[PDB]
């Protein structure tokens, strides 16, 4: 229902803001979704053509 959807969105917002302002863990501080700010070399790696199965 409309009220249930608003409550669900409110809980989602609370879950998102769980770690904003003097309530935050070391995991939250040092473990973020910052995958877009990493420059990684990807021209060296195993091509892995030969495999087996049973």
């Amino acid at each position: 229902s409309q009220a249930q959807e608003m409550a669900l969105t409110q809980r989602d917002a609370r879950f998102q803001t769980r770690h904003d302002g003097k309530w935050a863990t070391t995991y939250s501080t040092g473990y973020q979704d910052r995958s877009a700010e990493a420059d990684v070399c990807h021209k060296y790696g195993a091509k892995a053509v030969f495999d087996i199965q049973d």
Binding site: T26, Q32, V40, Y44
Partner: protein
């Protein structure tokens, strides 16, 4: 192929595994959602992630990991953290009540109500790997879960998987920095598993890492996050040979054979260099000889044990980046030349070298700095007997008047377990000295 299974035990294991897996995801371009959106440098369906990530019908790259802890704090915060989608809801299992730094409690009472499910999940993971290299178990023996449940898991894995490789990244109680008081008891009691069911036991004590970070990374305040990032860097350096291409590719058994001279002489210290800060990095030309010398120095070492008090038995070097084999050859030549570090007489070569093309990946927002080349040494040496001869001395001082033994004996463990562990450890110092003795 080349798959490897990572099992993290206890709070220390989970904390290390968090950094290890974020660094692996940054290596392989995998988001916490677990996808590969678009990469021009990546070839069509290139799979260098197969060692640590398994493909899923959803296109996801699920880690080949198993998190354990007898209480759900770290497990729940990981389940609600950034990598919710990356990590399976299973494979990240927890108990309900902690071991409370009790080896007996974690090995006989609380560990046994979850070790069965741990083996079930490990078997499920191993069924998906057709080229399983081995298991890396990350734990600290100074705790309850990591000691007891870790030992139980290793003992069961030995019979469940035969002669598969075991690599135990163990955090012993450091000579001065140490949290628990029953920590010497836990470390001494967990010695049998590390002696028998672990093929290679690598040292990652906290005090040496603290000294390394304060003296070389020039940050007044590193933390468990920083030490776990360094440990993850070490693990990635070890596994890079089987992950990516390189001039000299070495596998788990490949360095196992070269590093283990005798059936249980497999407790090995760890070192890594160049560990460098952002300001430090871009003013030095980090030559291969310089970084190798920094590795062999006893200040850039991740284990608090001075090598000058022992004989080097076998050193395995893992180079990453643009290293040419002549640089490492000259490093070996000058290392054999220099006298303040001494090798054992019966091991003339005593050196294994593995060069990997891809350099280490910096983690901005963490602590490391981008470097064109790096090297991690795993060294079996007789100097590691000092930490054993200190921990057993602490055990004797604690156990002389039966202090803190009622907690252990009330959890279904016999009193003779302490004596058996003490005798086994004593034989460990004895045969370390024996192999260190000249012919």
């Amino acid at each position: 192929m080349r798959e490897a299974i990572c099992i993290h035990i206890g709070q220390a294991g989970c904390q290390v595994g968090n950094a290890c897996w974020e660094l692996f995801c940054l290596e392989h371009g995998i988001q916490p959602d677990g996808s590969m959106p678009s990469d021009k440098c990546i070839g069509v369906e290139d799979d260098a992630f197969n060692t640590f990530f398994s493909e899923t019908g959803a296109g996801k790259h699920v880690p080949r990991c198993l998190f354990l802890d007898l209480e759900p704090t770290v497990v729940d915060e990981v389940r609600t953290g950034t990598y919710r989608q990356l990590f399976n809801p299973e494979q990240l299992v927890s108990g309900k009540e902690d071991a409370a730094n009790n080896y007996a409690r974690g090995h006989y009472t609380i560990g046994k109500e979850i070790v069965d499910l741990a083996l079930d999940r490990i078997r499920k993971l191993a069924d998906n790997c057709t080229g399983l290299q081995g298991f890396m178990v990350f734990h600290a023996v100074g705790g309850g879960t990591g000691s007891g449940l870790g030992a139980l898991l290793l003992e069961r894995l030995s019979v469940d998987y035969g002669k598969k490789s075991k690599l135990g990244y163990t955090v012993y109680p450091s000579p001065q920095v140490s949290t628990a008081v029953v920590e010497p008891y836990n470390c001494v009691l967990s010695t049998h598993s590390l002696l028998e069911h672990t093929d290679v036991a690598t040292m990652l004590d906290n005090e040496a890492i603290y000294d390394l970070t304060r003296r070389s990374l020039d940050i007044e305040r590193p933390s468990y996050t920083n030490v776990n990032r360094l440990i993850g860097q070490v693990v990635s350096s070890l596994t890079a040979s089987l992950r990516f291409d390189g001039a000299l590719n070495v596998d788990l058994t490949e360095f196992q054979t070269n590093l283990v001279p005798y059936p249980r002489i497999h407790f090995v210290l760890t070192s890594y260099a160049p560990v460098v800060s952002a300001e430090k990095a871009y003013h030095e030309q980090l030559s291969v000889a310089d970084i190798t010398n920094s590795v062999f120095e006893p200040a850039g070492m991740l284990t608090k044990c001075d090598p000058r008090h022992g004989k080097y038995m076998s050193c395995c070097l893992m180079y990453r980046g643009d290293v040419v084999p002549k640089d490492v050859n000259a490093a070996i030549a000058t290392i054999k030349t220099k006298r303040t570090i001494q090798f054992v007489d019966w091991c003339p070569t005593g050196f294994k070298c593995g060069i990997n093309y891809q350099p280490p990946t910096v983690v901005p927002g963490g602590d490391l700095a981008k470097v064109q080349r790096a090297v991690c040494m795993i060294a079996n040496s007789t100097a590691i007997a000092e930490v054993f001869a200190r921990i057993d001395h602490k055990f004797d001082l604690m156990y002389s008047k039966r202090a803190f033994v009622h907690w252990y004996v009330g959890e279904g463990m016999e009193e003779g377990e302490f004596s058996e562990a003490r005798e086994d450890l004593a034989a460990l110092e004895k045969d370390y000295e024996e192999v260190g003795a000249e012919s």
